[model samples]
Target chain A: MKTPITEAIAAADTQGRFLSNTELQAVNGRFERAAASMEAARALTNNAQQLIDGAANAVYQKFPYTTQMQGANFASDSRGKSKCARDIGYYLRIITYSLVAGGTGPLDEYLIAGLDEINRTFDLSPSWYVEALKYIKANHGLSGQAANEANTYIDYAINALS
Target chain B: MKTPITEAIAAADTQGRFLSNTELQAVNGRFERAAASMEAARALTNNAQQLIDGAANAVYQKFPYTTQMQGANFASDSRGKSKCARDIGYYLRIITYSLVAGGTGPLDEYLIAGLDEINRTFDLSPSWYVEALKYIKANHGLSGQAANEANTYIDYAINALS
Candidate 1:
């Protein structure tokens, strides 16, 4: 939750000082990029359930027959079905927040706090998450800077989780 | 979300008339036990994070070194931590809704529809749910009818999951 702006605010609060000019410019940067990302964010939430279900389905499609195996992550009888479905939904939800923020600074701090550890400790395979992110990225169907920003967010999560 | 009350209203809607006597009685019964259960539900949300952590920890405590196994569900490296923590918290949340409904009429119908299938297909062990329920029940710290109502909700979920 501590994005660049918030962390800056906190630093100033601690010292009872105002934000420095450099800090102000950094804070302004977030809003500068927030527009296109917000457009992309709107597209995702409006069609979330449909997009999410497809993303869930595409994971296995990308891996073909992998889910049919006994220990497969998406096996019908495994917590795989709901967990996989819900986890991707969770990922999508968080991605939207970052998109609105127009940067990954907040998300980076978040992952460092507990999410990164959770990803490391979770029994799930990182490959599954990677695939899910790829599918979500394609689904975004963005243009211009928003498209590039979307890729940046998705790739960061993949690399961090990886 | 369709509890006895909603379902009864649904039935009445279909018929374009008032609730049948049986339907009215069934709907009213939800409020009959609503008081004591609501009291217990209050106890839960007020101390949820603390009680949930205790419940999460109690599972391994009850099972001893079982979680230390290579493939143990609650292992440090498993989805066990966040998954288990969130799942119990999720359970607590829904139970409160049902407590407000005052009976398992809503909860029972709920499980039979989709939740039951989710539980059956979810890969986690039922014993894990059972133990969490036991711990939560103790944490309720209720007395008289409220205690009994808490037991009723927890016991029903255990039976359904088991």
Candidate 2:
């Protein structure tokens, strides 16, 4: 629910980095709703994560197609229905990073190398990466060959730690 | 904790209504954090307003200036400190409205009057004004002369209803 709201806001903000003045205002409406919803939703989130979660799910069920269909699948029976509205915009940032690396998984050296640049260029989180991978694997079926590729990258990440 | 976070977010978003291109990025940052915080706060608000209330007191202690001075004077004692945060924000908002009304009780009428306006202009809960006024009075303080004026206004409002 609020995920789509803020994602629209974030996208608008980021797009403002490149968008013409015309498109900027076009996207600003969601930013306004996201702003108001942010206040209302924060109250909701603090009071009841589950209730917020449920309400978002319900809202998304009513109007799911509006979101860009980016991180997760859209059809019926979708947990991607915005389990964490707070994190969706951040999660999308990781997807942008993955696209640069050619695909997704645990994140590789090349991807991780690009990460500092990504983090520097834009705001994102390690959690965003983890959540993005979760989103990709969960929604896009990034398993088997894709899963192995992801694991291979994660192994490199683990070995780098030791 | 959530209340201040929500209010702060709302204030920034309100400010965002007029942001220029460069400042819009800052607005974006504020909006993103606000939205996330809003969702996070709402979840906590629903699940454990009490627990979060306790935690807010502890966290606000760190921000001596913002939370301590205004809080001490507005709340005025340990007794008032324990009041609900929702009540506190409402208390503050009412005091705000009181000033504009020249301490007349007509402030609520003004608020109720705007209910339909806000509904048409934005997707909002019209009933939020009642809660808003109550919160303003509770959290923002209204003892002594101001309190009397506020009560007067409350009576007019109540009587008008009946």
Candidate 3:
């Protein structure tokens, strides 16, 4: 479940100040879940039935997408799956600040940090993160641990932006 | 809401002098609902999150794929969205036979009808119909009126194949 974006984040984090084994694992775990959820979203083939059936409806809902904002570009990304990956990538990066004291400061720096590398490697962009946060705020179906985890950083980034 | 697939079925039915207006509307309604559901499936952008968040889990489920068998191919199709469209197209063709006394027999004929037009215009295939039916049978998420309607044809196709 570790996408190229997350892998690069981990690699960059490793180069800077090596996170403890447990801390690194926690970050990895978030990325794993995030990647898993993104795949699950892409796996959904029965959209209308899921929407209308409303049983365990969260899995049935579409992930919202918005145009680029905050210096992140979402338009060129590969639809919703990558968008989810980008969200997790940014969230992982944001939480890294909390993990490694030497991590970059300011919300923008954390969000933008390593984005060029990630984009270069995985075709992901900071806008994916931006759009994903915006998506979660708009779509209530995004919940549970992964969502809660992402929300924390989304709020952090929003606060930083303000 | 009335796609070419549905319209073709209605037209073919009319040529053979079958299907009362009420029955035709009922068929159209089923197609409308089915098409709507297909659109909804295409709308699904995140597959991984829904997989983890196991509420009413059917909508979040991935439709299975299988290699071609019995003159049907399911492997080339994308995920579920195209699969659903194929189902509606085939089903519309299926019911058309009951409308057209001189129609071809068995599941394969109905499955193939209008596929050329659909393929040329929509990039959908008979394999999608086959896969969609196969998916519903394997997965429990498909239900309700549209599902029931589609399922009837699916069952008929399967039974005919047997």
All predictions: root-mean-square deviation over Cα?
22.0, 22.3, 22.6
Q: Model 2: per-residue lDDT, tens digit, A7-92? A: 32334334432223343333344334434333332222233334334434444554555243554333233454453443333223
The clash count of every prediction, one per candidate, is: 2, 41, 18
lDDT (10s digit) by residue, model 3, range B1-162:
122223333353345322234543443343334332332222221221232222112222432333222223333334433444434433443332221111123234434444557555654344444444465444424445434544554466645433
Q: Report the TM-score of candidate 2, chain B only.
A: 0.28
Ranking by lDDT: 1, 3, 2
lDDT of 2 at B129: 33
- For candidate 1, the docking band is incorrect
**Candidate 1: lDDT of A97?**
52
Off by over 4 Å in 3: A1-162, B1-24, B35-107, B110-136
Question: What's the lDDT for residue B76 in model 1?
Answer: 65
Candidate 2 residue spans exceeding 4 A from truth: A1-162, B1-114, B154-162
Query: What docking grade applies to model 2?
Result: incorrect
Residue B25 lDDT in candidate 1: 54
* Model with the higher lDDT, candidate 1 or 3: 1
Q: Which regions in candidate 1 have their CA more than 4 angstroms from the true location?
A: A71-73, A109-122, B1-162
Name the candidate, 2 or 3, with the larger DockQ value.
2
Q: How far off is each candidate at the interface, as Cα RMSD in Å?
A: 20.2, 17.1, 25.8
Please list the C-alpha lDDT of all candidates, in the order they appear: 0.65, 0.36, 0.37
